[PDB]
Amino acid sequence: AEPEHDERKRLGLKTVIILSSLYLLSIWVKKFKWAGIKTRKFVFNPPKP
Amino acid sequence: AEVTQLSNGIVVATEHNPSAHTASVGVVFGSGAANENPYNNGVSNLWKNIFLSKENSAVAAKEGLALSSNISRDFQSYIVSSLPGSTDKSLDFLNQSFIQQKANLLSSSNFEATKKSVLKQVQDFEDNDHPNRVLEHLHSTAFQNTPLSLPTRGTLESLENLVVADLESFANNHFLNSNAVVVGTGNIKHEDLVNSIESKNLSLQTGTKPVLKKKAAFLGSEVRLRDDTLPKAWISLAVEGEPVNSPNYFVAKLAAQIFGSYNAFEPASRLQGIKLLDNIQEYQLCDNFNHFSLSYKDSGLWGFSTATRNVTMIDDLIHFTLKQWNRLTISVTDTEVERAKSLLKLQLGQLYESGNPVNDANLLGAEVLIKGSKLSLGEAFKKIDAITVKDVKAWAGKRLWDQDIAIAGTGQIEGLLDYMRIRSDMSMMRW
Numbered sequence: 001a002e003p004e005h006d007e008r009k010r011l012g013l014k015t016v017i018i019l020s021s022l023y024l025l026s027i028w029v030k031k032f033k034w035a036g037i038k039t040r041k042f043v044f045n046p047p048k049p
Numbered sequence: 050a051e052v053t054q055l056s057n058g059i060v061v062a063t064e065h066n067p068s069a070h071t072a073s074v075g076v077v078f079g080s081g082a083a084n085e086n087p088y089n090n091g092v093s094n095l096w097k098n099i100f101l102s103k104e105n106s107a108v109a110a111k112e113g114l115a116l117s118s119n120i121s122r123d124f125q126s127y128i129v130s131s132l133p134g135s136t137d138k139s140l141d142f143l144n145q146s147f148i149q150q151k152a153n154l155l156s157s158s159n160f161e162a163t164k165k166s167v168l169k170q171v172q173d174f175e176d177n178d179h180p181n182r183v184l185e186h187l188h189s190t191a192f193q194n195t196p197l198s199l200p201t202r203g204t205l206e207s208l209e210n211l212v213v214a215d216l217e218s219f220a221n222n223h224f225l226n227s228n229a230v231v232v233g234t235g236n237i238k239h240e241d242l243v244n245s246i247e248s249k250n251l252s253l254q255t256g257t258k259p260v261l262k263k264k265a266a267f268l269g270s271e272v273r274l275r276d277d278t279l280p281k282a283w284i285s286l287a288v289e290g291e292p293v294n295s296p297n298y299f300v301a302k303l304a305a306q307i308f309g310s311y312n313a314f315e316p317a318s319r320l321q322g323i324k325l326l327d328n329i330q331e332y333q334l335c336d337n338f339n340h341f342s343l344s345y346k347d348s349g350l351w352g353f354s355t356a357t358r359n360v361t362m363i364d365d366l367i368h369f370t371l372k373q374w375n376r377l378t379i380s381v382t383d384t385e386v387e388r389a390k391s392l393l394k395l396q397l398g399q400l401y402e403s404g405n406p407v408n409d410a411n412l413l414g415a416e417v418l419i420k421g422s423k424l425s426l427g428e429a430f431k432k433i434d435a436i437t438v439k440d441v442k443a444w445a446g447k448r449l450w451d452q453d454i455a456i457a458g459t460g461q462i463e464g465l466l467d468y469m470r471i472r473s474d475m476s477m478m479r480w
Binding site: 033036037 | 469
């Protein structure tokens with residue numbers, strides 16, 4: 001019923017390692033690219049009439 | 050074209066020029082706004098204002114003398130202009146105000162009338178001089194929590210809380226001898242002035258040195274002063290430049306000349322040999338712009354400033370300008386470098402040699418205070434002409450390519466994209 005069994009699981013191990021790594025790496029890249037907006041600071045000085 | 054300077058007790062510097070009609074004398078101190086603190090910021094500007102006060106100014110006017118002073122970041126200067134004959138009466142007024150009246154200028158009726166003037170002054174600046182207001186803020190964020198970040202005119206808050214004791218405190222720490230240089234420009238000889246000075250003795254606080262601090266550093270950042278009620282958008286952008294007395298002081302100054310300055314309303318300006326003009330003139334991206342290579346003791350700023358009414362295309366203005374700067378690292382041409390050399394000489398000339406001794410005084414004092422001597426105009430040209438395309442390319446690859454920047458702007462700046470967008474344009478994709 002599942003002749004591809006052994007091969008399928010081998011390909012799975014490769015696929016899951018790459019995607020896991022890619023996922024972790026993307027988070028780091030995203031945080032870096034966002035740091036300027038994230039730590040951004042505002043100050044309000046009411047304009048005179 | 051003579052740079053004469055000798056030290057006896059006080060370091061005396063002069064630059065004589067026969068045909069002049071007038072002559073100027075004064076002292077220049079090796080300490081300015083970069084020596085103040087966030088809380089006594091504005092002390093130097095205050096001094097300048099009392100030194101020019103109605104009382105003190107009326108005394109020299111009777112005598113036929115004129116007063117002038119300028120506050121900068123690394124230095125400060127007090128100057129008295131006169132005819133070629135009264136080159137001595139200036140030295141009397143100078144000593145009279147810095148030793149005898151260093152307590153008469155600080156009365157409770159003069160200081161209060163002066164303080165009220167600098168307050169309406171600095172306030173007026175922040176309310177209307179947008180381009181300078183922005184350039185001042187550029188230094189503010191670029192060098193934050195460091196000396197160069199302090200505005201020369203001082204902040205309205207550190208100003209209204211400043212007292213006479215602070216003036217004295219600063220004066221007793223920076224208006225010293227080892228941190229001073231007596232300058233003389235106009236027509237008078239080096240040996241003419243040096244005599245009238247070595248005559249009157251008295252050291253007055255000798256051996257004393259000013260306090261030290263922490264070295265100035267650049268930080269990629271920005272400050273956005275949005276104001277939708279203004280009719281334009283004023284922005285200034287820069288990378289860490291070159292300090293005075295740097296091997297690249299000139300390459301940088303030349304690099305800025307390549308893009309130079311522009312004024313969309315002056316017909317001749319539109320015809321200049323700047324490639325950037327082909328891009329910005331199609332949709333009229335700005336009313337004007339001007340590049341610069343500001344230099345100071347510890348650091349500098351290389352970039353440009355611009356003003357625009359095309360508030361919906363600011364990203365193109367910034368994008369094209371930054372694409373042109375990319376070229377300095379990879380494709381600047383020989384003829385662009387050459388066009389720059391000529392134009393740099395022309396502007397450097399008009400600065401070092403105008404028909405006004407007061408400018409000469411400031412330049413002379415400022416230079417001798419940082420490098421113990423002045424570089425002759427002719428010596429500069431030799432260095433300028435020696436610059437090759439390879440030099441510009443090596444410099445840009447270090448200061449411009451993929452380097453942090455500093456930004457500041459006011460007015461209708463909604464169209465000025467985020468930091469990372471601008472920051473990304475400091476380079477190009479390649480295989």
